[PDB]
Amino acid sequence: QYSPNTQQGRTSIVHLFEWRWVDIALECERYLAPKGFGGVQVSPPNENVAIYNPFRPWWERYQPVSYKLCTRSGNEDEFRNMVTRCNNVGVRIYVDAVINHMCGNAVSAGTSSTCGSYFNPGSRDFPAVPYSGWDFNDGKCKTGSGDIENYNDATQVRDCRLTGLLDLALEKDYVRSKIAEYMNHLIDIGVAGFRLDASKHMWPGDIKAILDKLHNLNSNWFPAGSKPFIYQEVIDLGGEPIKSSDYFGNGRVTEFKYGAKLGTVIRKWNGEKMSYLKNWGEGWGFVPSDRALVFVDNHDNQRGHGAGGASILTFWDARLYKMAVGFMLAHPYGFTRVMSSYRWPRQFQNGNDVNDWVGPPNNNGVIKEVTINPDTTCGNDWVCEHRWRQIRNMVIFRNVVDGQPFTNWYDNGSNQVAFGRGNRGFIVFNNDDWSFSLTLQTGLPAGTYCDVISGDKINGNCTGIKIYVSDDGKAHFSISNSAEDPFIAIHAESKL
Ligand SMILES: C[C@H]1O[C@H](O[C@H]2[C@H](O)[C@@H](O)[C@@H](O)O[C@@H]2CO)[C@H](O)[C@@H](O)[C@@H]1N[C@H]1C=C(CO)[C@@H](O[C@H]2O[C@H](CO)[C@@H](O[C@H]3O[C@H](CO)[C@@H](O)[C@H](O)[C@H]3O)[C@H](O)[C@H]2O)[C@H](O)[C@H]1O
Ligand SMILES: *[C@@H]1O[C@H](CO)[C@@H](O)[C@H](O)[C@H]1NC(C)=O
């Protein structure tokens, strides 16, 4: 459960948040495969409640109605097609598994679902699965309201409702089986792993019981004995009775301290500075690298919906975001996930964005098609961070330097640092308020390299900055603090 199951040489996955199955199928063939991406996180593929007030928010997808592969992203046939095509070009699919609960208890009964399924929250009836009152933790939860009231109580966090979401009785073999039924259907379809949503609200042991019921990956695309990749969403920052280390036995975990700390260091908040990143990783009190799934932002905190707070960097802070993603992709710690979002009308009031609920680009509820512009960018309000030269190229950089050790670190005691990955790559950052001009030991073989942030190495030439490495591996770097992208990166494959 610790291996991503990506084919040899691909080191990252991208979250194509809210994308339609058909657009992802195309993306695998026309971009992801060619550009070297390892896989994709898809939004929950199972049927959810259709919420019209507000109008189809993104979070209505974390409010399950059944396990039918039928959502605004597409039906089951489109889903299978997508998984097939993507696998056929070596790009894996990872399903966002929402198994801790069903919908909110206050939701009106009826057939307001993405697939017409009938559900009745008030009476605990989800006939499409089916589930009834006996399958929820109502009698087990001890809070007066029935919802989680105190996170300092590990029991309560697991047995009570997360903001009213009907909590499933995961200790029951029946419920465990209905969930494994769902997951094995996906596995046999060809998916390579799962993101276990809200794993903090499930007992480590109940999760393990469910994983024991799972098949090995589809033998038509994966070698015999392959177990699905499992990453647990567990938000573990400061003091709480629950620790992310309690889930190491089921798979990897989301290391949220990563994006929070990186955000403040790069924002230079409260005395933080890049020079402190020398011992980035476990040295900062993070989980072990082989159990970590890292990222700069995720669908929740990029809109202030989770831990990380104000320090989190997102596409809205483009300049510093590229720098953070750059550092992440260059550094060896953990397994990296790149975010790919859509624009929404941020409307800040008293410091809070009242439009954080807005769902994906759409026409009367119908999600918009991802259109590709002549410059490879996207239209219809899809941000497509994964298509940004600086990010796309750093995804490739990670692939090239994969396995190479961290070395040749340099820092001016402030905000301009540099380090390399063995003799396969080197990167330099200037985050100070003054220019950076200096000759640094790079550890790369002599030659002329194309900087992959400012340009590309296209047919014998660089479209951007060029770096010259001498015989002793030295090379000169000059980065004005006024550069659009205050950092340079070169690797074995960008050498002319
Ligand atoms: C959001 C976050 O809260 C905790 O995170 C805690 C953290 O553990 C704690 O330590 C401290 O930091 O506070 C955090 C915030 O509560 C969990 O530990 C963590 O697992 C969870 N994140 C995952 C799971 C859910 C829930 O199904 C998703 O939520 C998403 O779906 C929910 C269900 O539709 C949404 O609620 C929505 O529906 C409810 C229905 O009753 C409403 O009452 C609620 O007002 C409305 O916003 C929520 O806004 C959205 O973010 C989310 O996309 C996904 O990433
Ligand atoms: C690089 O570009 C120049 C023109 O700017 C051209 O003279 C040169 O031949 C090109 N090199 C290759 C290898 O195509």
Ligand SMILES: [Ca+2]
């Ligand atoms: Ca629970």
